[PDB]
Symmetry: D2
Subunit: 438 residues, 4 copies
Amino acid sequence: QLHLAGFFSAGNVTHAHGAWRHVGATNGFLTGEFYKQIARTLERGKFDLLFLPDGLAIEDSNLETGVGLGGQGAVALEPTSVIATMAAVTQRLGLGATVSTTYYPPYHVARVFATLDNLSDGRISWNVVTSLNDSEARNFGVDEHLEHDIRYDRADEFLEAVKKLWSSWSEDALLLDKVGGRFADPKKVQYVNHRGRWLSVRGPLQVPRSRQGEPVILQAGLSPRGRRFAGRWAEAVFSVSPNLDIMRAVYQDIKAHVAAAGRDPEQTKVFTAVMPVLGETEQVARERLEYLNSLVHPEVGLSTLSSHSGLNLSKYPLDTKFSDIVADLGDRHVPTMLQMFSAVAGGGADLTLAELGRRYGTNVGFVPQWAGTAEQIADQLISHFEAGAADGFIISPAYLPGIYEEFVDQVVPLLQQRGVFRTEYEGTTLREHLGLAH
Amino acid sequence: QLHLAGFFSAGNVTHAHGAWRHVGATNGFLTGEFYKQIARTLERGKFDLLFLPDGLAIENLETGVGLGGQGAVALEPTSVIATMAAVTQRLGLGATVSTTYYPPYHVARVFATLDNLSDGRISWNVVTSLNDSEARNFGVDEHLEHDIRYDRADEFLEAVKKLWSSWSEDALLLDKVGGRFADPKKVQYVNHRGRWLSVRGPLQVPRSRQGEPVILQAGLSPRGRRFAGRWAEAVFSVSPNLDIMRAVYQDIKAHVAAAGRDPEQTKVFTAVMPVLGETEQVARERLEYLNSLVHPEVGLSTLSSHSGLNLSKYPLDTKFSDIVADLGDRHVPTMLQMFSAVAGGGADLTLAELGRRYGTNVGFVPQWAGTAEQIADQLISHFEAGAADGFIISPAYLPGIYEEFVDQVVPLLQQRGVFRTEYEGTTLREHLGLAH
Amino acid sequence: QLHLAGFFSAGNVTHAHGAWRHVGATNGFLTGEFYKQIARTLERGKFDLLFLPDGLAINLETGVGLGGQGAVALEPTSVIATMAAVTQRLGLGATVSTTYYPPYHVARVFATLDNLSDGRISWNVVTSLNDSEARNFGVLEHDIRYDRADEFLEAVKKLWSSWSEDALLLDKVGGRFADPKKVQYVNHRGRWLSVRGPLQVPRSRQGEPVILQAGLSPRGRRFAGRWAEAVFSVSPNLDIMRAVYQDIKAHVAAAGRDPEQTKVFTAVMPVLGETEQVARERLEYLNSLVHPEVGLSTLSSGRRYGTNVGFVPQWAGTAEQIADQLISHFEAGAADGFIISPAYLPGIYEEFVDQVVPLLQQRGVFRTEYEGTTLREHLGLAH
Amino acid sequence: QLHLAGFFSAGNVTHAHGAWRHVGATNGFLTGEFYKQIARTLERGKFDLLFLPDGLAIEDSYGDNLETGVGLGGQGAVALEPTSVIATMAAVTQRLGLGATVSTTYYPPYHVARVFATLDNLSDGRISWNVVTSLNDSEARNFGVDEHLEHDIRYDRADEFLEAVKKLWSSWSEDALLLDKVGGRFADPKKVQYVNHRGRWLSVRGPLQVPRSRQGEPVILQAGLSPRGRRFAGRWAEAVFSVSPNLDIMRAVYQDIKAHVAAAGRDPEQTKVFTAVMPVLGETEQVARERLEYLNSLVHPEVGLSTLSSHSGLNLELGRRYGTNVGFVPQWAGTAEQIADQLISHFEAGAADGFIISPAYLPGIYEEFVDQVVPLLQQRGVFRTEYEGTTLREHLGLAH
């Protein structure tokens, strides 16, 4: 019976790089009302989960492009407080935030999330990132650098250290015996004394366990070391794949990685992203999808493409065809995700830089756009789920808050009527909704 | 016209160490409903603000966990704030974030974030302290020297202020048709590079309608008052009578003036712990009850902490003069000598009782038992005698006493014209009569 | 395991006739914020039920001048809707009069509120006729009004059954909005009343609203016997509580109905204090505010009448003690639950919920959490 | 500066008869959340007003049975009592004006005076009452009224009704309530007067049990339409809900209502005329056009004929088109740019003081309207950005 999650940047773009220009986009990303509407709506639709990405710098891989146009991370509210905002005016919905292990210490993370877990009565989850981008570092004044795979080694200790902090109290530690004078059993709140290879945390956490026990672990995963890590730690996995073939592979692989780590593969829920665009008739929808992708300024997509590929494409003029870039530099010395994308996005065509950017801003090259009816969006979700594509689906928003209104009003009751999706919330915590253990 | 502010730890105790034991104490400090209630009530009561302190370690743990210890539970205040802001439209909100365990980018962003999510009602209380147990939680061990932590904070504040000016009024154009998201000319890098700190990129959050979050400052130390002088826009103080309130008050204003700033733009608050009854006699019985709940050891735990001296070394019997024997009268802290003198009236108190009394207020928070008329009278007399620009209603027990205070006291202050009826404006700067 | 109920006039007094004067009385009775607060607080304390009484009329020297009964009174149905909108479990009840409003009116309003509250509503049936109200609505014997109300209840109930579960379909594809064989004309035509067309409102998840009843007169308790699923009562001590209880129970059996399917509440008026003396000193404060004439306005339609309403027990205590007496009276068969008459508003319920409720829950005699989502489930009633 | 109102039946249909079938129709009309969203959303768009109509019986005028009305989405098939819904909406909003239809034929003046004074107080000055005087048989059989008064006489009786209502709303007077807790005076008894109304059609004695809101009196709304109706609107209506298919008829009706308000010794600008339009939005012109087609394809012929039967007063593809709008509600398919344009060009040519937005489907269309159209009206300066005042009188440019 299928999970659903939302996901969007607390700011100007998620995957659709024209979203902000959309006639129906509010741009209320500065305002609490915007986040409260979205979340309440996903709660209305009985979604498992809504979670926020994070980036700690305006992307400059100058400011002409990122700020002037609507570039990735140009506005980025701190996710945790927005998650808190959301949790206040909702009672079942799962809520998740990205917090980095490279820039934040384990005690902070341990507390931040145990607070939100308690404030929300067990509905919280942390998305563990480990990236050490430069543009982010220069905002945090961090220069120390550790190698990609070592960051995940560190992160393993990080998570062990946090888990200890979430175990520092224990079910039944907090008595509130006013009469007898006992605030809590001191035997049952132990020091952690985490002293290990990368991190020190001594004193116990100052937040007991929510009804949920611990926050739910989210992991992007993706890299080879990354999938060992998800394998060990992830309970829900956020994955972006452009078709059912790649979906199926990523799915089986995560499951293998969870099982190789000595875990139950059913206890780690894998989500793939899609970007639905609804119409009353299929034709409407297609026209609505054309509208949407037409808003993407070429330079902004290119900006993001540049960043993602790790190769400044501003260097070149916008008419430059792609093979002439693969010419100017080495056909070896040209990153592989990039050559892949440009074959796929053009289907064999030798696109100009602007076109390539235009299309990359559409999704982020790899998020399926599904233009359809509601019946058809439900069909496709059920087919993919029944085909082994994922345990649930992240719903990327074309524009906010409207598309989430559309999807919850239109597609959700169809999913419910067919029996493949939750009609009422059976439990109260996020761990119950994803069907996980303690 | 006088300002009113709430203040309580997002956890088990604030100043009144019996608060958790109290019969009307909900102890919903783990829950959103609790903080949503309290913040809504102070909004009903037309308060200027409600700010939270923060402490980053439970203060062995036998006493702290066992009884109502300082820090024992402390939710991270940013989230708790965010929560209150979501069900609230006028009430200003504040969080303590430390400059010592968090870089400038983090702080400038959270607060620009809450400041935007609350539509201009947020404030940052700047702490510079380095407690041992907190460092043991964040894996720091090397410690900067007290006066230097302020010289650092001076840089930190310069850089956080730069971040919040990185955007600028009316740079975010949302010109969908023309496809201009913002003015890249009107968004500049900071490229801060001073002695202890680097922060570059523009902050990824524009200014709220407020402009910048409002600066809070707890002041105390001689260096701190030079710092409060430069930076503080509101000041939180704890003086136990009118002479010290006056003294602290003019002192702060003199530091603000000395810094080339306007003293009228720095509101000074002093904390008072009103207890209410329908008669003065009932007030007194209700104050007696509350202070009756303080376990001596808990109070002592907190006093040990605040004095900068571990008092578990001596048994509970030990009278104070024998401690001032065991250690020299020059090798004993002078907050503790002033406390035992004031709290015992010259009596040579057992260490238990000495703690019991410290855990009642935190030694220095006026307890005022009164009727509602008397509380409004004491508030008004104090305000008119120059004690403070406003008051920190320190809560005896939660959430009850704020319900009592807003229903009973506020409207009286309102009928005398010494307090707002309706919030005139919408930002926390407007409520405090501050600029930009 | 014992039920709890709120009760207060949507206006200036309920039973403490000096309540408006109290230092803590907010006098929010005009404002939406007032009622939303109380309702939410009563839900916080896991109360079964909050309900409003009503009267349709207030020379005015005594009434308006000082704090009289009905001096101000907002129309209950709209206040109840205000409460339902910012709550989700707590049951809500209003008084509507069978003598000035037609069957269709009542049936549809309580069905609307039932549907709006997702099945939490209750109607308190009143058949009484007062001169001041008659002259306000432009207008029979006592016992005959109840013979009329018997017909009224049949008509309301038929109307509520006019739709039937799963009649509504919303088959957008097929274009069938509802099953017209499953929505039916009532065609009521009894001795006093005519009401025909189907009710324009289907049944809530509760099925029907919960019926309350005041009881009182010999013929009144026979009415409760037939119709009442919940029975507000006032008795000044346990002996009379005991007597009323069994009398009601016996009438219900006498009507051929399951006695424990009808829930008996007794009004008590707690005043809380942190110690027994504070409790008592607070009680002295409350009754000091009572004007002698004001009690006499209500008593006619003397000073100590308007302290309680002569008969509502004032229990001053410490929370332990209010918990003790709540339990002791329950265990001695006084009532299945307790109407908490409020000293002053909204203050007292903040006290009762914060202080007494936890203790009732610890000894394990009152719900910690709502097991069900309907008022029917909370009271352990059927369909 | 131009006004805007929401309008929909607290049930299954308003003007668009295929609405319940629409793919994005929540059909949450039984549930609290549905109304609370709509209110809050129209509040988000800075709307003057949302008001509910009311029908006191299922429409069984067509085919003599429930068959069509219940089996398809017939006029009034479900209809919640609107005074409750208004209070539900008011509980979670603070500026948005709220109006309920209540009937002078089946309810006494004391009832009406008090409910609306109660909602006025609870909403803190945002309430209005839409006065109706109809006397249908299906409604009478639900209420047991065998009696009948002729059309125009019903309005003569309505005149008294409103004289009596207003007396009751004057029964309390500002600063008569004084909660002098110390003194012991709950209210100045000399400033709460009896009404002692004893006219031709009605009696109502006592004072109203509910004082005046900050607003004073609820705003009086009114449908008008008939010769004697238009005179009544003239004397009493502070707002007027109208339905007109083209610009000529809009102005003509507009100028006419003004003349009646003038003819009754009143300021014509103190009565705001609103005309109904039914926008359908698209990101493109083509999309809007498609969306309007979809919508209107859902209208099942019989349900259109049924409401035509009712509206005309005669039992019975002609019905398909009538169910589209209600024959005469203009449907505008456009782009938001274009819808905002039409709103302005009509406003500027004196077609109306404000616009009723009739909802294609709920709650989604108002979500679209508010997100898309409102800001453009705002950005052009023809519509509220903030609420300048906090009462429905203030938003509408009205007095005491």
